[PDB]
Design a protein around this ligand. Structure first.
Ligand SMILES: *[C@@H]1O[C@H](CO)[C@@H](O[C@@H]2O[C@H](CO)[C@@H](O)[C@H](O)[C@H]2NC(C)=O)[C@H](O)[C@H]1NC(C)=O
Ligand SMILES: *[C@@H]1O[C@H](CO)[C@@H](O)[C@H](O)[C@H]1NC(C)=O
Ligand SMILES: *[C@@H]1O[C@H](CO)[C@@H](O)[C@H](O)[C@H]1NC(C)=O
Ligand SMILES: *[C@@H]1O[C@H](CO)[C@@H](O)[C@H](O)[C@H]1NC(C)=O
Ligand SMILES: *[C@@H]1O[C@H](CO)[C@@H](O)[C@H](O)[C@H]1NC(C)=O
Ligand SMILES: *[C@@H]1O[C@H](CO)[C@@H](O)[C@H](O)[C@H]1NC(C)=O
Ligand SMILES: *[C@@H]1O[C@H](CO)[C@@H](O)[C@H](O)[C@H]1NC(C)=O
Ligand SMILES: *[C@@H]1O[C@H](CO)[C@@H](O)[C@H](O)[C@H]1NC(C)=O
Ligand SMILES: *[C@@H]1O[C@H](CO)[C@@H](O)[C@H](O)[C@H]1NC(C)=O
Ligand SMILES: *[C@@H]1O[C@H](CO)[C@@H](O)[C@H](O)[C@H]1NC(C)=O
Ligand SMILES: *[C@@H]1O[C@H](CO)[C@@H](O)[C@H](O)[C@H]1NC(C)=O
Ligand SMILES: *[C@@H]1O[C@H](CO)[C@@H](O)[C@H](O)[C@H]1NC(C)=O
Lengths: 272, 50, 369, 98, 49, 49, 49, 49, 123
């Protein structure tokens, strides 16, 4: 069921800067042509962002377990749909319930169960040289899923699993918070054209979903897909992601004429 | 460090500062005021009202 | 008379008094609720064959329905009913957004723990409400359903835990609790405990030990699109008039007009600088409407002394007069920079000023005066 | 000189600006809760019955009265300063102009 | 207008201390009167044109 | 045994730890109300007389 | 500092009417400015030393 | 929290009144100082120069 | 301390409490001393935050350089947010982020106690 992947190199973690990223619409009220002050958890401006890689070249396939703390800012720069989803929980084994949110390329599945997760979870796509096709071939992630209390499955779709050459073209940003039983997700999708780290700019994320989960989340793990032609027989593709943490902050938000947040001030950044 | 050391002192100035009450300095110092006064006196004695 | 009441006098001397503001009244009311035809699943929530154990409480989403509570009047009887963020009498005029029903069985002496701010084995280890709770807690005796002669042991609660639960947290693990110094790798004796216990529910137990069914309805009000509404009848939408209204439970008075504001898909209401609703998305036609207050002001009264005459002139500061938002006309209408003055004759002769009006204009009482 | 240096008339511009700011402040202050569950009377009345709504409304009324009282007090103080300036101007008209 | 915004229930409660509003307006009216007076003292010194 | 209400008993409690959880596996109370302190704060406090 | 004393819960409640504090400081700042201005008008009349 | 909030709001309102009273008194006193400073400036011009 | 919470700096005290006194209070009736429950030592409590900060700003339409004045810092671990050189000490406080110039000029942005600042030239 589970596979322990090998043949990876050893690099220190990379770091980048968050600039002005991580702002989301704090409410569901239309406002326009106004400055508004709010106090939610936010990614602080110009904060320390940990940079993780999936590269083939110095092979890396970074999918570590990270702390969740008070909430997470997550971002991804991709060309070929490598990052599929996340695991949230505490012990991440069949002692406690945990949340699994995964895009498996045919549907999107959200489950809350006493999952026994793999110690190196992944998904994967096999390339058929014959007739040039990219197909889902593997789903590991867990060995068991007992006592499920929440479940959602999306309508069917077909993901483009083709490997790509070129720069990163898709920036996806998410904010994850766990408050009074709800797992709150905010998101934004921005087109990009970049070759290294998280791009500069400003965009506010919109609410996506409030999930009635009811569990304790202290750690989380990112699920990446593999490419194949086995613990050594694999290709890392190409993709990168960034993780930051939210802290209570006061922000001055600027709403333009059409009610879009176009700018902001982090009131705790400095004396100016 | 002066307000932290001298606690037994019960200094009213520290009590005010710890509660957010601050006294700001004047822009003109006493030395500067004395210079303006001296100029006016020197002027008067030397040239009267002119 | 408004001047006389303000001054607490039956006599008013010569001069100009400000007199409130021009106001208009609403003429009709508008009620706009989403066109929901389904009745809410009261049967499924309150008439269920089985309820969950409190340690593993159930949660169900309620949506796209009418919250007509009266259907329970010919069936259910509740010993406990309390609402926290809304008055009970207002429930039928409102719409609700994320409505969930939590469901479980506890003892009668534990019913008091299902409340914000409580402690005890249920409040601390099985089910907890937030202090900032909007919703209603409903409970009733189920001794004739959940009790058995030899004891109904199918309902469990958590007795042992290392830390307290957070609001709306569920914990269904069965790991052995360590009360002492022993690691408790299994063992389950000495100072090691299985964390859950059963309730011995029997028909002969005293009331404090009889089972109670508890339903908790969690919801949010007036800030987002709603899918569950009370039993109100929608009316037609009336524009460009002063009307009273109710949009998804939010009431007010004002003038509704078409708007050019573009709300994001999740935005139902808009607000101004004073955080007052100034726009809504109509529930049936998804049109954005702007709301303008009915009353806009600008009124003062020019008075000769009342010991001379009772003729007055009224100045409307914001009326152009060139259906004028005035109380009356009756000719003698003169327009100046200070407003539309009604009730005074304009004279082409200049005189010294007596009662100043403003912007170069004065008034006086003169001759048949 | 007057055309060249726009700051020359700052003394008159300041009067205009101060009064405008004071009125805009009163409007902005309407958004304050003052201990109430909501700054909007309609939210209070849409959700609460009379005896509960009354508590929340009294909190807002007291706060709103303080905002107006603060405004009036500041206008009286400023007016006194204007009066002094006007008296100076009147003296100058009599002694410098006539 | 400022306090209640045409809400009837608020207006009826506001009446509990209506002497306050009257007093606020006496103060503002007095200011308005002085502003016209100040203008005349500075400029209308000579009534011969 | 408990005392008659007309001649109610009174006992001094001192030099101990107020761990109320010991009652969870035994007692069941139909009534419980605190007046000068919130129930949730009892475990963080010390008491005098 | 004056009102809450670094208590976090108070600070978060104080924010319900934070426009008030800003207004109090605008008033005090204006006074501070005048005090330096008053000093110059009385003494710095002649800039020739 | 929900009980503490009531008690804290009572203190915040009172603390704000103390600061507002202070500021109002400083503004009144400052006006008196300004008048004295203007007198002094006049004397400098007319008595000293 | 025995259920009474707070934030502050604890130091040894010379206050002598009577046998029945557990807490001491200041003029504002705020606890400013406690008797430790295990070692019967009297400790004084001093608030952590002591103030004195202001910011000197060229217009933001010109530059984003600012200087920060610490009114109660001597600078001669300074209770400042940062240093970065350009540290000048005056009677009005420790000014960090400005170059001291020996030339006198007319005043532009007043700081206090005879000191003014301006934005001048590579400005
Ligand atoms: C959420 O999970 C964490 C991690 O399991 C819990 O924190 C532990 O609590 C035990 C008991 O007090 C301590 O011995 C551990 O040292 C704690 N671990 C960490 C990393 O803090 C936490 O209590 C859980 N939350 C709830 C509400 O139960
Ligand atoms: C991978 O190795 C870890 C020990 O480092 C072990 O816990 C885990 O179960 C192994 N998984 C597989 C599939 O061998
Ligand atoms: C945090 O950012 C700094 C640069 O400001 C960098 O030197 C450092 O390595 C980063 N991360 C950590 C964990 O120190
Ligand atoms: C994705 O998940 C759904 C629901 O569990 C399942 O029916 C489907 O076969 C899965 N697709 C793949 C490629 O594994
Ligand atoms: C390509 O060939 C492989 C091997 O025979 C087969 O499994 C795969 O289904 C084929 N591709 C498509 C699109 O059917
Ligand atoms: C607002 O939207 C309109 C189109 O409806 C567009 O023309 C205008 O430029 C937008 N304004 C801003 C500030 O983006
Ligand atoms: C529960 O079932 C009874 C019939 O046994 C029925 O009369 C009653 O109306 C039902 N209750 C609800 C809420 O539907
Ligand atoms: C959890 O799983 C166990 C079996 O391991 C089962 O007996 C129990 O009923 C399940 N559900 C809950 C809520 O404990
Ligand atoms: C029913 O709801 C739809 C969708 O909101 C709306 O378009 C339609 O006009 C409504 N119906 C009436 C008046 O029957
Ligand atoms: C009233 O409206 C007319 C246009 O119909 C305009 O010329 C006149 O100036 C307006 N009156 C005032 C006092 O502004
Ligand atoms: C126990 O209490 C005594 C008396 O207050 C004290 O002197 C002693 O240090 C305490 N004990 C420890 C740390 O064991
Ligand atoms: C700073 O401390 C020194 C002693 O190290 C003292 O001479 C100097 O006057 C102090 N600075 C100020 C502004 O008081």
């Amino acid at each position: 069921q589970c596979v322990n992947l090998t043949t990876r190199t050893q690099l220190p973690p990379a770091y980048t800067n968050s600039f002005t990223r991580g702002v989301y619409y704090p409410d569901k009220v239309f406002r326009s042509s106004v400055l508004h002050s709010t106090q939610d958890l936010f990614l602080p401006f110009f904060s320390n962002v940990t940079w993780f890689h999936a590269i083939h070249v110095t092979k890396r396939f970074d999918n570590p377990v990270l702390p969740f703390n008070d909430g997470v800012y997550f971002a991804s720069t991709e060309k070929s749909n490598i990052i599929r989803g996340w695991i949230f929980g505490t012990t991440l084994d069949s002692k406690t319930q945990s949340l699994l949110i995964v895009n498996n390329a045919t549907n999107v599945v959200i489950k809350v169960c006493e999952f026994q997760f793999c110690n190196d979870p992944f998904l994967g796509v096999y390339y058929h040289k014959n007739n040039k096709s990219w197909m889902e071939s593997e789903f590991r992630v867990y060995s068991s899923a007992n006592n499920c209390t929440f479940e959602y499955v999306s309508q069917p779709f077909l993901m483009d699993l083709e490997g790509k050459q070129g720069n990163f073209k898709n920036l996806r940003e998410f904010v994850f918070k766990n408050i009074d039983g709800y797992f709150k997700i905010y998101s934004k999708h921005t087109p990009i054209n970049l070759v290294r780290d998280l791009p500069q700019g400003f965009s506010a994320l919109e609410p996506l979903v409030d999930l009635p989960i009811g569990i304790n989340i202290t750690r989380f793990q990112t699920l990446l897909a593999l490419h194949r032609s086995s613990s050594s027989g694999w290709t890392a593709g190409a993709a990168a992601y960034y993780v930051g943490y939210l802290q209570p902050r006061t922000f001055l938000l600027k709403y333009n004429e059409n009610g879009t947040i176009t700018d902001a001030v982090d009131c705790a950044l400095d004396p100016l | 460090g002066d307000c932290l050391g001298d606690i037994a002192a019960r200094d009213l100035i520290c009590a005010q500062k710890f509660n957010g009450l601050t006294v700001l300095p004047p822009l003109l110092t006493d030395e500067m005021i004395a210079q303006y006064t001296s100029a006016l006196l020197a002027g008067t004695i030397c040239s009267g009202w002119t | 008379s408004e001047t006389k009441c303000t001054l607490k006098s039956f006599t008013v001397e010569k001069g100009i008094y400000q007199t409130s503001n021009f106001r208009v009244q609403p003429t009709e009311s508008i009620v706009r609720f989403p066109n929901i035809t389904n009745l809410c699943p009261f049967g499924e929530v309150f008439n269920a064959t089985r309820f969950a154990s409190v340690y593993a409480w159930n949660r169900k989403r309620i949506s796209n329905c009418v919250a007509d509570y009266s259907v329970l009047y010919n069936s259910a009887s509740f010993s406990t009913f309390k609402c926290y963020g809304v008055s009970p009498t207002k429930l039928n005029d409102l719409c609700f957004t994320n409505v969930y029903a939590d469901s479980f069985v506890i003892r009668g002496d534990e019913v008091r723990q299902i409340a914000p701010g409580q402690t005890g084995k249920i409040a601390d280890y099985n089910y907890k409400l937030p202090d900032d709770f909007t919703g209603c807690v409903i409970a009733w005796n189920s001794n004739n359903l959940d009790s058995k002669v030899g004891g109904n042991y199918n309902y469990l609660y958590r007795l042992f835990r290392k830390s307290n639960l957070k609001p709306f947290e569920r914990d269904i693990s069965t790991e052995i609790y360590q009360a002492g110094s022993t690691p408790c790798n299994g063992v389950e004796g000495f100072n090691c405990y299985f964390p859950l216990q059963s309730y011995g529910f029997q028909p002969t137990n005293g009331v404090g030990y009889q089972p109670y069914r508890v339903v908790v309805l969690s919801f949010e009000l007036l800030h987002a699109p709603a899918t569950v509404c009370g039993p109100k009848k929608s009316t037609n939408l009336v524009k460009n008039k002063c009307v009273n209204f109710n949009f998804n439970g939010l009431t007010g008075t004002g003038v509704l007009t078409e708007s050019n504001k573009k709300f994001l898909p999740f935005q139902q209401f808009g607000r101004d600088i004073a955080d007052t609703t100034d726009a809504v998305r109509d529930p049936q036609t998804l049109e954005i409407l702007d709301i303008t207050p009915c009353s806009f002001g600008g009124v003062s009264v020019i008075t000769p002394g009342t010991n001379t005459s009772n003729q007055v002139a009224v100045l409307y500061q914001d009326v152009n007069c060139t259906t004028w938002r005035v109380y009356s006309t009756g000719s003698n209408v003169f327009q100046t920079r200070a407003g539309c003055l009604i009730g005074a004759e304009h004279v082409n002769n200049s005189y010294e000023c007596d009662i100043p009006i403003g912007a170069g204009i004065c008034a006086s009482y003169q001759t048949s005066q | 000189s007057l055309s060249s240096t726009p700051s020359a008339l700052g003394k008159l511009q300041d009067v205009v600006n101060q009064n405008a700011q004071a009125l805009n402040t009163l409007v902005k202050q309407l958004s304050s809760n003052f201990g109430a569950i909501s700054s909007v009377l309609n939210d209070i009345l849409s959700r609460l019955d009379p005896p509960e709504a009354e508590v929340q409304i009294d909190r807002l009324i007291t706060g709103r009265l303080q905002s107006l009282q603060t405004y009036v007090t500041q206008q009286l103080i400023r007016a006194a300063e204007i009066r002094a300036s006007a008296n100076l101007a009147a003296t100058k008209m009599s002694e410098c102009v006539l | 207008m400022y306090i209640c915004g045409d809400s009837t229930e608020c207006s009826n409660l506001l009446l509990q201390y209506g002497s306050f509003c009257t007093q606020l307006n006496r103060a503002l009216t007095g200011i308005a009167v002085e502003q016209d007076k100040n203008t005349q003292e500075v400029f209308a010194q000579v009534k011969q044109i």
